[PDB]
């Protein structure tokens, strides 16, 4: 196989690379559902995204990846990028329909807004934020896809809609008010706070790559 | 302020008028309606920038979709329109997936969709297409909207456009011809190509 002894799926694997500015935007999406839904998950850390066992869990070379056991539990599932992570993480583990949709009317919503030189960038982002603060401001919709609750698509967007994102592209996160309420009220969730703690973290405690016991 | 004409009697697609650079998105879900054979109408929106369509998609952009629920829905971009077609009409789950597992690999394909970058897009592709088995890009045994998603992308014409030689990924090159076989696929090709062509240039068909 020329796998690393230590990676075995017992349960669902979260694949990370060692936490930095540029390293955890992605990342951080799959932890947030996996810490909302209390779902049992171990973190493995990638030394390399670029060897070829990796490839073989994810062929784009990137985390997040998430290596898991079946329904069944016969054989090993994968699910690859931030929004398909999200999309599994719910399948497999969000019965209720909390975050993922409980009927077809709220996954037409969901699924709407998960899917969704530097002034070229800079207006470009704007133009998405504007299309964020416009839906906010919508009587009684204080999350993106549902107005009662949070969903995958609040998840898959708090990391690019936050004051620290804006700050990077030379925006003024106050411009927008709806959509700044909406990422502090996102940022004070338990799970969100968990997951943005642990996401800096990996590969800085014990362990520097390979399966995490903490 | 809607036009007059645009009634929700069944599903709806929002297309533009027929081009060589205005079908690549609009077709992926128009193949799965022909797949399933979903009784749906089209409108071509004349202006996108229209408030009108901007109360549909605020992206301002086609392909989208207005639909009844099962007792009004709105769907915007090619990926979730696929979604939510597959969600509507696809019980069966042949091209949306049947259980947990198939729908981990469709999810991984359907959401994967400068020389360099799409030439490092097709290598994933053709190593995909080389696995044992592996005539299609989810699952190894038919067609899902992950392969739907992923044809008007990967075919000799777009190839060509982006400066590449189709021939160069011979097992992607054959399951976008495989692909083009099918029924439903010749079937959207024309209709897409034709919309804005027709006796109303603008508005409901």
Do not use: C
């Not at 583990?93 to 009317?105: A, C, E, I, L």
């Not at 909406?182 to 014990?206: L, Y």
């Amino acid at each position: 196989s020329e796998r690393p002894s230590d990676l075995v799926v017992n349960r669902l694997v979260l694949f990370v690379v060692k936490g930095t500015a540029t390293s955890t935007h992605n990342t951080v999406k799959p932890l947030i559902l996996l810490e909302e839904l209390g779902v049992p998950h171990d973190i493995y850390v990638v030394e390399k995204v670029s060897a070829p066992w990796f490839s073989e869990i994810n062929p784009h070379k990137m985390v997040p990846a998430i290596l898991d056991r079946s329904p069944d539990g016969r054989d090993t599932l994968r699910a690859w990028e931030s929004t398909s992570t999200l999309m599994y993480i719910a399948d497999a583990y969000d019965k209720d329909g909390t975050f993922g949709g409980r009927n077809v009317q709220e996954r037409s919503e969901i699924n709407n807004w998960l899917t969704l030189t530097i002034e070229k960038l800079r207006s470009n982002i704007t133009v998405q934020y504007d299309i964020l603060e416009r839906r906010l401001n919508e009587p009684g919709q204080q999350y993106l896809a549902l107005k009662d609750r949070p969903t995958i698509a609040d998840i898959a967007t708090l990391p690019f809609a936050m004051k620290s994102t804006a700050e990077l592209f030379g925006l003024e996160f106050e411009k927008w008010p709806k959509l700044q309420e909406w990422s502090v009220r996102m940022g004070e969730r338990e799970a969100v706070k968990r997951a943005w703690q642990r996401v800096a973290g990996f590969g800085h405690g014990e362990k520097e790559y390979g399966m995490l016991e903490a």
